[PDB]
């Protein structure tokens, strides 16, 4: 719950919130950097990737 | 779009497509090991946490 959630929409607080996302983390591509809901599923995927390639 | 999409439940499939999750990897706790939502909730928590430490 920091500044990113702070100035996230309820629907992404959600979102992070249900699957562990640091908003601080995602890159916003909304107006003015405003994270959408797209942003939050590129970062998942990209996360899964790099999990599933860790040892 | 393998085995595991196969059984999963239309809501699950689709939370897989949309988070790039290979159902696969995910241990269901419903019934007879049915993929619920809160297991697809918990391996991505855990996929973000083994991603930053690597
Ligand atoms: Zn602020």
Do not use: C, M, S, W
């Not at 929409?9 to 249900?18: F, M, Q, V």
């Not at 916003?28 to 998942?44: F, N, S």
Request: hydrophobic fraction near 40%.
């Amino acid at each position: 719950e920091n500044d990113a959630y702070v100035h996230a929409t309820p629907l992404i607080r959600r979102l992070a919130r249900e699957f562990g996302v640091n908003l601080a983390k995602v890159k916003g591509t909304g107006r003015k950097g405003r994270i959408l809901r797209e942003d939050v599923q590129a970062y998942v995927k990209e996360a899964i990737k790099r999990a599933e390639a860790a040892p």
